[PDB]
Paper text:
We further obtained recombinant S protein of the PT52 strain using the porcine IPEC-J2 intestinal epithelial cell line, which is the native host cell line for PEDV. Having obtained the recombinant PEDV PT52 S from the IPEC-J2 cells, we subsequently determined its cryo-EM structure to a nominal resolution of 3.1 Å without imposing a symmetry constraint. The structure exhibited a D0UUU arrangement as opposed to the predominantly D0DDD arrangement for the intact virion-derived S protein structure. Two of the three CTDs underwent an 82° elevation from the closed conformation to adopt an open conformation that was not observed in the structure derived from intact viral particles. The D0-up conformation of the recombinant PEDV PT52 S also differed slightly from that derived from intact viral particles. While the identity of the PEDV receptor is currently unknown, the CTD motion observed in the recombinant PEDV PT52 S strongly suggests its involvement in host receptor binding. Despite the variations in the glycoforms between the IPEC-J2 cell- and HEK293F cell-derived PEDV PT52 S, the atomic structure of IPEC-J2 cell-derived PEDV PT52 S perfectly fits to the most representative (82% of the total population) cryo-EM map of HEK293F cell-derived PEDV PT52 S, which adopted a D0UUU arrangement with a lower nominal resolution of 4.5 Å due to preferred orientation issues and smaller data size. Another key finding is the up/down motion of the CTD that was only observed in the recombinant PEDV PT52 S but not in the intact viral particles. The lack of clear CTD motion in the cryo-ET and cryo-EM data of intact viral particles implies that such a motion may be an artifact due to the detachment of the S protein from the viral membrane.
Numbering used by the authors:
A (entry chain B): 1008 to 1015, 1026 to 1191, 1202 to 1254
B (entry chain A): 909 to 1015, 1026 to 1155
C (entry chain B): 464 to 507, 638 to 958
D (entry chain A): 761 to 859
E (entry chain A): 1206 to 1254
Write the structure that this text describes.
């Protein structure tokens, strides 16, 4: 609703988008009018009319005079072409980004941080039509607060088995396991942990009897044999 | 030497001193405004990024040793199954040697220090060259009797003079259009570079990149750290 | 042309000006009465030089004619009599009798008027005094305005500065961006939570309107004799037309291959079919009803699309793209489009209309 | 001396397999590669009227007949500068906690 | 990992069932499996003792 009201600050806001749209709709008309006004000028010739030059002057000197117009108007025509090529080059890069933007942000969710709508975790994005282009509305998740916890490097049970997390993007804190991007605490499961040959000092020291408290899913194979 | 040398026009209308080049061209309607961000804010941005790769939490109480950040970034691409101390000092020793070697280089090819130096030198030279080319066009009399409009009006009758001054009005206005056209080209080149730079920091500096070869050529990219540079950034991948 | 605001508008030959920074000329002496100054080398002996200092004067200095202010300066250049920059522009001359040097400056200096909210709220200038409240001494220039307060809401940003709509100037503060938690193995960490979703907007242009220029008719104006001289220029006209046509064709093929539309996605893109349970998509989706216009069902643009099109398009709708069928009639006085078509410029329709573009947007949604 | 620039050998990247001989890279060392990226241009504002006419009152009348050329110059320059200003001012976000 | 040499003992959670065997797979028996995968729990053996 705030976007809708804003259409009735800075980059990546509605105000910047509106300014860009206005320049797009104005740029084309400006170039054409500047081209057509060049016909008014007489490039140091008798007149801006070729027929008037030929009527007033003799054929030999008239040819020299119209060379001023031919060179003058042709140079003014070359400037218009050079200006359009710059816009065509600029737009070509713009639509290539737009094609990447729709393929990676609209039709799918993007891992690339900051690509779809600046900072924040991009959840989805939708598109609206706009004069000679697309207006992208990128919906990004912004966290209001932060949960302060103590990340554990891993487990060392019986000082014999080093047991650490497998997924790099997962944290084991105080015990819970949760994503490092959003606070979704979860009870640890043995499938989340993998065995490591060498333990380190930073690991939490544990015993085989205390381990099932940390990992309720753990199956103590031998304790369950001595029963 | 420093960006503060960027001249001021406050003393330019004073008229009690012979005009230097900056004032001599400001008398022709050309005013070079200061760059958008000075080196101080640019360096602050670079320092902010470098200090944020070791910010492990919301508050400053979560400051980390840099080895911990490197260790996490190593686990991101391959779970370290034998984290020996020696395995870590080797990387630290290699980085220390390599960072000093760049330092000595500043005091060959693409993606090296020498290529970056040439680009930076061209950046600081290009803007001055275009402005000087614009100002030197004033001395040319574009097929007129003189390059001075007042001189033409004194020598000739107002009817004939209007033709002569129109030769240089066309000539100067065309020279002014050439300066704008090559300025827009420069602005389009920088826009492509700035979009990449924001793309580069978001995917290589503020996070580790899964796109192979994106952050500094081939190999597995661990981190990148930014430094300020004349009118831009210098990425160390 | 009385108000300086009106003066600026008339210089821009527009009744309404977009917000920005507009070049401006320092207000010179309203009553001209310019004294005449004349300096030249002595001849025969006899010296006839005379000059007026610190007043905008019409001067002839050693053959250099112009209008400017002559001011005594403290330099003591020992060589020459008059001095110029590298571009041959007179900077100072020497009173040959006494050796003092006088600098020559323009009578008026360029200024930048800050035009926001349809008013001149401030002036960037090199002069310390003007017709405003206060002057702020920025490091590079003076800034005159009617509000010396700090600028915290820069409506118009430019170079290192930003100006508010009240006329206040300031620096653009370094915005505090979104914080990102660097990953780590151990110690205190902070997991973000209480997520709230915010929409950031970005406009991306897809195409330009193709323009075909018949260089023969633009240059020669249909004159058959002039076409003979144009042929002596070989491929100048040929390459102009080739460049324009190639650009249009590349852009056309790219955006026709880009805009792929699925029918089922369209069926789910209507307000009746879509169900954003809790997510209000009414402003994002467009209505579609059976159109009496040739029976074909029409889908109107969404509310946001209508807002983005109507208020911005100077002609209201994209269908106002003129047709040249009525241009060759000649039974009416030519308008702008017909007048420029008579000069060999034909603005062909854009590659895709707003309807197909809106259809593509609805397909993605 | 002159010479053809030799084709520099790249860093070998192992194509993933299913079975058979494979090679796993090991004993890494970190090398830093530098890349300079430009962010902005110094804005330049040209007063078209005083550049062309040199402050001459009578020459400004003739310049008025050129309509919007002397205006499009200034408009394009300041518009480009404003886009650069807003883009890099929004791009540079600074966190004091990281500072 | 294929990107770094980080040797590690296989874990039961690293493997997943497949409908059909293939000729390139290594030929094994339930007695050899715990040697290959120390984490494997032989349900029949652990219940029959
Ligand atoms: C260039 O410099 C010369 C030398 O400074 C200037 O000539 C000086 O002009 C003033 C006034 O025109 C002379 O003042 C004299 O005062 C006496 C006493 O009141 C009076 O009797 C004289 O009739 C005259 O007014 C001054 O003597 C004279 N200096 C000389 C001749 O050496 C000259 O004005 C400067 N500017 C030019 C030449 O454009
Ligand atoms: C983040 O790490 C810091 C240290 O790296 C932890 O700070 C320490 O926290 C403990 C317990 O909160 C403090 O112990 C006691 O603090 C209370 C006041 O809160 C007081 O009775 C004594 O001063 C006692 O020492 C300890 O002082 C403190 N150390 C500091 C601040 O240097 C912090 O607990 C960690 N974060 C979390 C969420 O645990
Ligand atoms: C890698 O793949 C190769 C073939 O694809 C496997 O065969 C091994 O190839 C090496 C290289 O020739 C043999 O080593 C040498 O073989 C020659 C044969 O006359 C002989 O001079 C020696 O016996 C020497 O060892 C190796 O014997 C051969 N092994 C087998 C079982 O065919 C190879 O096993 C694969 N793995 C490795 C680690 O090479
Ligand atoms: C977890 O255990 C490690 C392993 O150290 C051994 O076991 C301990 C219970 C203790 O008996 C140590 O002396 C044993 O060497 C502990 O790591 C030790 O930490 C102390 C701290 O001062 C240090 O002096 C020892 O050198 C470390 N031993 C090493 C590196 O082998 C660790 O402190 C225990 N606690 C935690 C929270 O990790
Ligand atoms: C692993 O087993 C496959 C499956 O074949 C069966 O199991 C074998 C152990 C043996 O008992 C075969 O007789 C069984 O049919 C083996 O695949 C066989 O490969 C040979 C060699 O070409 C072929 O002649 C057989 O037809 C294959 N049997 C099939 C496809 O069912 C395989 O050789 C065994 N060993 C290895 C290293 O893969
Ligand atoms: C400076 O000029 C400004 C612009 O007018 C003055 O500010 C307001 O001026 C209006 C009328 O011009 C008054 O009605 C307001 O009371 C003024 N103050 C406000 C709106 O806060 C101002 O009075 C002038 N003098 C100064 C600032 O000393
Ligand atoms: C407007 O902004 C300027 C620029 O920051 C301020 O100037 C300094 O602001 C700091 C703020 O911490 C003060 O400590 C300094 O004393 C200020 N110096 C000067 C010379 O002013 C300025 O104070 C702000 N406010 C006004 C009314 O100008
Ligand atoms: C979803 O958006 C629609 C917009 O169409 C809202 O409906 C309008 O709400 C305004 C409130 O300011 C009313 O004045 C209009 O009469 C409503 N109808 C229109 C514009 O057709 C609606 O309230 C929003 N929320 C929902 C549907 O839950
Ligand atoms: C754990 O199981 C192994 C395997 O049978 C056995 O050798 C060991 O004795 C068991 N641990 C204890 C404490 O009994
Ligand atoms: C520079 O690099 C070379 C080889 O890469 C290395 O031998 C040398 O030690 C480095 N310089 C320093 C100062 O470490
Ligand atoms: C005179 O010139 C000197 C430089 O030579 C300058 O510093 C001074 O401000 C000038 N004005 C005086 C001394 O009144
Ligand atoms: C934000 O998260 C904190 C966690 O520290 C929680 O206590 C608080 O209730 C949350 N705010 C809400 C749910 O509005
Ligand atoms: C002009 O007006 C007359 C009125 O009798 C009408 O018949 C004719 O069609 C009109 N022509 C045009 C070109 O409007
Ligand atoms: C790194 O590892 C390789 C293979 O594992 C070994 O050949 C080499 O000597 C090692 N480099 C050292 C120890 O510096
Ligand atoms: C293993 O146990 C399951 C269930 O108890 C049984 O169906 C299967 O036949 C057993 N296999 C062997 C080889 O004993």
């Amino acid at each position: 609703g705030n976007i809708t009201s804003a259409f009735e600050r800075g980059l990546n806001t509605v105000a910047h988008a509106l300014t860009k749209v206005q320049e797009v709709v104005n740029s084309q008309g400006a170039a054409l009018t500047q081209l057509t006004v060049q016909l008014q000028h007489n490039f140091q010739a008798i007149s801006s009319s070729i027929d008037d030059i030929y009527s007033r002057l003799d054929p030999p000197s008239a040819d020299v005079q119209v060379d001023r117009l031919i060179t003058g108007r042709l140079s003014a025509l070359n400037a218009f072409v050079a200006q359009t090529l710059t816009k065509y080059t600029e737009v070509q890069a713009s639509r290539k980004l737009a094609q990447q933007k729709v393929n990676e942000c609209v039709k799918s969710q993007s891992q690339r941080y900051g690509f779809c709508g600046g900072d924040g975790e991009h959840i989805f994005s939708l598109v609206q039509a706009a004069p000679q282009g697309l207006l992208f509305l990128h919906t990004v998740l912004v966290p209001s607060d932060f949960v302060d916890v103590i990340a554990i490097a891993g487990l060392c049970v019986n000082d014999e088995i080093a047991l650490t997390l497998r997924e790099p993007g997962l944290v084991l804190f105080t015990y819970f396991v949760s994503s490092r991007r959003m606070f979704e605490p979860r009870k640890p499961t043995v499938s989340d942990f993998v065995q490591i040959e060498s333990c380190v000092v930073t690991y939490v020291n544990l015993t085989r009897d205390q381990l099932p408290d940390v990992i309720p899913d753990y199956i103590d194979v031998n304790k369950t044999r001595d029963e | 030497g420093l960006g503060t040398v960027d001249e001021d026009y406050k003393r330019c209308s004073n008229g009690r001193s012979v005009a230097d080049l900056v004032c001599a061209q400001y008398y022709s309607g050309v005013m070079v405004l200061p760059g958008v961000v000075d080196a101080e804010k640019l360096h602050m941005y670079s320092a902010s990024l470098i200090g944020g790769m070791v910010l492990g939490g919301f508050t400053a109480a979560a400051a980390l040793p840099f080895s911990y950040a490197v260790q996490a970034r190593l686990n991101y691409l391959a779970l370290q199954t034998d984290v020996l101390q020696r395995n870590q000092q080797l990387l630290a020793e290699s980085f220390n040697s390599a960072i000093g070697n760049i330092t000595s280089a500043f005091e060959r090819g693409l993606n090296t220090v020498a290529h970056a130096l040439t680009k930076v030198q061209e950046v600081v030279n290009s803007q001055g060259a275009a402005l000087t080319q614009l100002t030197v066009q004033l001395q040319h009399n574009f097929q007129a009797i003189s390059s001075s409009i007042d001189d033409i009006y004194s020598r000739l009758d107002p009817p004939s003079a209007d033709v002569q001054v129109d030769r240089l009005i066309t000539g100067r206005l065309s020279a002014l259009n050439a300066f704008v056209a090559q300025t827009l080209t420069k602005y389009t080149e920088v826009q492509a570079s700035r979009k990449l730079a924001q793309q580069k920091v978001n995917e290589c500096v503020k996070s580790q990149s899964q796109r192979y070869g994106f952050c500094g050529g081939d190999g597995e990219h661990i981190f990148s750290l930014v430094q300020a540079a004349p009118q831009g950034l210098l990425f160390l991948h | 042309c009385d108000d300086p605001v009106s003066q600026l508008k008339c210089s821009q030959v527009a009744f309404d000006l977009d917000d920005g920074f507009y070049p401006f000329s320092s207000r010179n002496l309203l009553s001209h009465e310019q004294p005449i100054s004349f300096v030249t080398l002595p001849s025969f002996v006899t010296d006839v030089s005379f000059m007026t200092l610190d007043v905008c004067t019409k001067y002839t200095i050693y053959g250099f004619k112009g209008e400017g202010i002559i001011t005594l300066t403290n330099s003591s250049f020992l060589a020459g009599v008059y001095y110029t920059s590298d571009s041959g522009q007179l900077l100072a001359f020497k009173n040959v009798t006494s050796g003092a040097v006088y600098s020559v400056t323009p009578c008026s200096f360029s200024e930048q008027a800050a035009y926001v909210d349809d008013d001149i709220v401030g002036v960037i200038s090199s002069l310390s005094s003007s017709t405003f409240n206060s002057t702020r001494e920025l490091p590079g220039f003076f800034y005159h305005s009617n509000d010396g307060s700090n600028c915290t809401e820069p409506v118009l940003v430019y170079s290192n500065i930003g100006v508010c709509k009240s006329g206040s100037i300031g620096y653009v503060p370094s915005q505090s961006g979104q914080v990102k938690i660097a990953p780590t193995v151990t110690g205190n960490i902070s997991i973000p939570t209480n997520f709230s979703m915010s929409i950031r907007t970005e406009y991306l242009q897809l195409y330009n309107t193709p323009v075909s220029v018949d260089c023969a008719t633009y240059v020669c104006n249909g004159n058959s004799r002039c076409k003979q001289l144009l042929t002596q220029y070989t491929a100048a006209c040929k390459t102009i037309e080739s460049a324009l046509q190639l650009s249009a064709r590349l852009e056309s093929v790219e955006v026709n291959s880009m805009l792929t539309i699925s029918e089922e996605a369209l069926q789910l893109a209507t307000i009746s079919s879509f169900n954003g349970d809790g997510y209000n998509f009414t402003n994002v989706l467009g209505v579609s009803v059976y159109d009496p216009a040739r029976g074909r069902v029409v889908q109107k643009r969404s509310f946001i699309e209508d807002l983005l099109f109507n208020k911005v398009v100077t002609n209201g709708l994209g269908t106002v793209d003129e047709d040249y069928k009525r241009c060759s009639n000649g039974r009416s006085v030519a308008d702008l489009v017909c007048a420029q078509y008579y000069s060999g410029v034909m603005v062909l329709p854009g590659v895709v209309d707003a309807e197909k573009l809106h259809m593509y947007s609805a397909s993605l949604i």
